[PDB]
Design a protein around this ligand. Structure first.
Ligand SMILES: CCCOc1ccc(S(=O)(=O)N2CCN(C)CC2)cc1-c1nc(CC)c(Cl)c(=O)[nH]1
Ligand SMILES: [Mg+2]
Ligand SMILES: [Mg+2]
Ligand SMILES: [Mg+2]
Ligand SMILES: [Mg+2]
Ligand SMILES: [Mg+2]
Ligand SMILES: [Zn+2]
Length: 297
């Protein structure tokens, strides 16, 4: 054991409501690492994951500490906090967004783990340890890092699954993490948009289900863009720090990013579940804000 594990295992886990992890407008700026750790336990708990898969408290805690440890603090945006926020957005979409009832337990288990693990060991959009020797290169590496952790002694939060359940969950996890490659999202989204507009969308079809999960991953991954203005400015500042340093051109970049990538996604997601409207809403409000700024710059 480490001190950190000891403290985390021994701590009381406040409720979902006390932790605010059900709010789409959630922010982690004022939280310590330990506090994000507790939030994460609460997520697995209220999703019924500890229950239905018999996770041992000490194993979950060690797992989360392992996941956090394998992000780099030295990377301004792509770090544990971003991973943690992606998972909190998944949680909020499942509960407040009422998507939980559209999915199986194994899908839910896999999305949470995928959300937390999808950028593992990221070195910043600039850094180029993609050699070699020459596709979703980063995402494959994030998934390897995830599997490694899931297989570490003391960390095996899936031990309680049968082999069948386990194989299935692993495949879903892998797909979810690969889905976070924006290049995949752009190739796949057309089909998702067609289905929605032709009123054809059907989650009971395995193919369409898998496509939705992919889209849900992207939605959560990009969710900083949906946050209240003061918070989104701060995050945008971290992103900029990573992109450029590891400035009035920035407001129009954000507008372009919102137009090209974000709006349609959150519009589609709201069609699937009207209770995910808050994401669409916050994204629009942020477009106002950035546009206004761009017109002075
Ligand atoms: C404010 C700093 C600049 O912000 C951006 C500028 C450009 C673009 S992009 O989509 O046109 N660009 C195309 C090339 N590709 C390699 C990288 C992405 C994205 C952002 C942007 N992305 C994210 C998602 C990571 C968040 Cl969360 C964010 O806030 N801002
Ligand atoms: Mg809210
Ligand atoms: Mg701290
Ligand atoms: Mg079920
Ligand atoms: Mg990524
Ligand atoms: Mg063991
Ligand atoms: Zn990400």
């Amino acid at each position: 054991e480490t001190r950190e594990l000891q403290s985390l295992a021994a701590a009381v886990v406040p409720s979902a409501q006390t932790l605010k992890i059900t709010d789409f407008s959630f922010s982690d700026f004022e939280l310590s690492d330990l506090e994000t750790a507790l939030c994460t336990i609460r997520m697995f708990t209220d999703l019924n994951l500890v229950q239905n898969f018999q996770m041992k408290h000490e194993v979950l805690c060690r797992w989360i500490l392992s996941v956090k440890k394998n992000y780099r603090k030295n990377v301004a945006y792509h770090n544990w906090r971003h991973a943690f926020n992606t998972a909190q957005c998944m949680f909020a979409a499942l509960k407040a967004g009422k998507i939980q009832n559209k999915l199986t337990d194994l899908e839910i288990l896999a999305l949470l783990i995928a959300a937390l693990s999808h950028d593992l060991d990221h070195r910043g959009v600039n850094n180029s340890y993609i050699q070699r020797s020459e596709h979703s290169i980063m995402e494959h590496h994030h998934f390897d890092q995830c599997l490694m952790i899931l297989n570490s002694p003391g960390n095996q939060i899936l031990s309680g699954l049968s082999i069948e359940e386990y194989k299935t969950t692993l495949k879903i996890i892998k797909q979810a993490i690969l889905a976070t490659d924006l290049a995949l999202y752009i190739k796949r989204r057309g089909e998702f948009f067609e289905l929605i507009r032709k009123n054809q969308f059907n989650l009971e079809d395995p193919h369409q289900k898998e496509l939705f999960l992919a889209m849900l991953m992207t939605a959560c991954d990009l969710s900083a863009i949906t946050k209240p203005w003061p918070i989104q400015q701060r995050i945008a500042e971290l992103v900029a720090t990573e992109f450029f340093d590891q400035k009035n051109k920035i407001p129009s970049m954000q507008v372009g990013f919102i137009d090209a990538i974000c709006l349609q996604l959150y519009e589609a997601l709201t069609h699937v579940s009207e209770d995910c409207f808050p994401l669409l809403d916050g994204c629009r409000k942020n477009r106002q804000k950035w546009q206004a700024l761009a017109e002075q710059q």
